[PDB]
Scaffold this active site. Structure first.
Site, PDB file in Angstrom:
ATOM      1  N   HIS A 236       0.843  -1.269   0.134  1.00  0.00           N
ATOM      2  CA  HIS A 236      -0.082  -0.166   0.117  1.00  0.00           C
ATOM      3  C   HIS A 236       0.994   1.367  -0.042  1.00  0.00           C
ATOM      4  CE1 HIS A 236       1.013   0.219   4.320  1.00  0.00           C
ATOM      5  NE2 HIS A 236       0.417   1.468   4.271  1.00  0.00           N
TER       6      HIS A 236
ATOM      7  N   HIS B 167       2.398   6.817   0.463  1.00  0.00           N
ATOM      8  CA  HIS B 167       1.825   5.987   1.155  1.00  0.00           C
ATOM      9  C   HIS B 167       0.245   6.442   1.222  1.00  0.00           C
ATOM     10  CE1 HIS B 167      -0.504   4.890   4.982  1.00  0.00           C
ATOM     11  NE2 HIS B 167       0.757   4.027   5.272  1.00  0.00           N
TER      12      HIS B 167
END
Lengths: 150, 150
Positions: free
Chosen positions: B57, B72
């Site tokens: 992710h 992020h």
């Protein structure tokens, strides 16, 4: 080998046991946490203070050795909006191990803080070859908590 | 002057407005956030992928120009354990701007994630002369989001 000295007194706790994914999952780095017993937070290395939270409950430091650390009193402490904390040190101040950076009112914090667990983390993971975590009780500005190999 | 290209489509947001003290207080570096509207995360620069989180992710890339970035997706997204993400690239991969790194499921994440706000930060702050933050709506791998000097 570089030694990171206790930024506060208390007992070393598994970082993954901290109630905060950001810490528990090492997003920002790895390190250890400390269940506090004292009244203040000191520089864990000789270097330069980086930033201090505007609620004064956390701060970062750059060691001369080249290690970057983040020390954050308790969990979700921002919500406290600065209550119980006094800033001693200044942003880019040049410090030595043991120099006081923030002073806290623990009894108060223990009452109002969601958690008092205090993460000590190397935000600098890529630049380091090896991080060894110590265990047990630590005394502010005296005891090693972490040893690194850079 | 280095131009950082949008790694996802969306709207630029202030990093200070991210619901995460670590990011908001830029402990992790400085940059911007994006409220995503697409389905993929691409390389914001020509460089090499560094690290891809095991939950696929978030990732690190270093541009050829020597800038270190960290993308992020969302806030506290690691807690989803990889659900809604698909790693497309590999760690160490050499990429060009626009190369797909990861694909995600917006609607799923919009439903499950605490927040889809996506920080894009520079982790190299000490090596850069200036960071000029841009504004508005961006289009994946096309629209510049930051301009840096030295």
């Amino acid at each position: 080998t570089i030694e990171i000295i206790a930024p506060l007194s208390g007992e070393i706790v598994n970082i993954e046991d901290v109630p905060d994914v950001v810490f528990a999952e090492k997003i920002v780095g790895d390190g250890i946490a400390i269940k506090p017993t004292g009244n203040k937070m000191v520089a864990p290395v000789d270097g330069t203070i980086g930033k201090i939270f505007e609620t004064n409950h956390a701060f970062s430091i750059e060691s001369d050795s080249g290690v970057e650390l983040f020390v954050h009193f308790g969990i979700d402490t921002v919500e406290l909006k600065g209550e119980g904390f006094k800033r001693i040190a200044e942003e880019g101040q040049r410090v030595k191990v043991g120099d006081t950076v923030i002073e806290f009112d623990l009894p108060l914090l223990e009452e109002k803080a969601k958690s008092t667990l205090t993460p000590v983390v190397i935000s600098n993971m890529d630049e380091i070859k090896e991080l060894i975590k110590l265990s047990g009780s630590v005394t502010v500005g005296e005891t090693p908590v972490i040893r690194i190999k850079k």
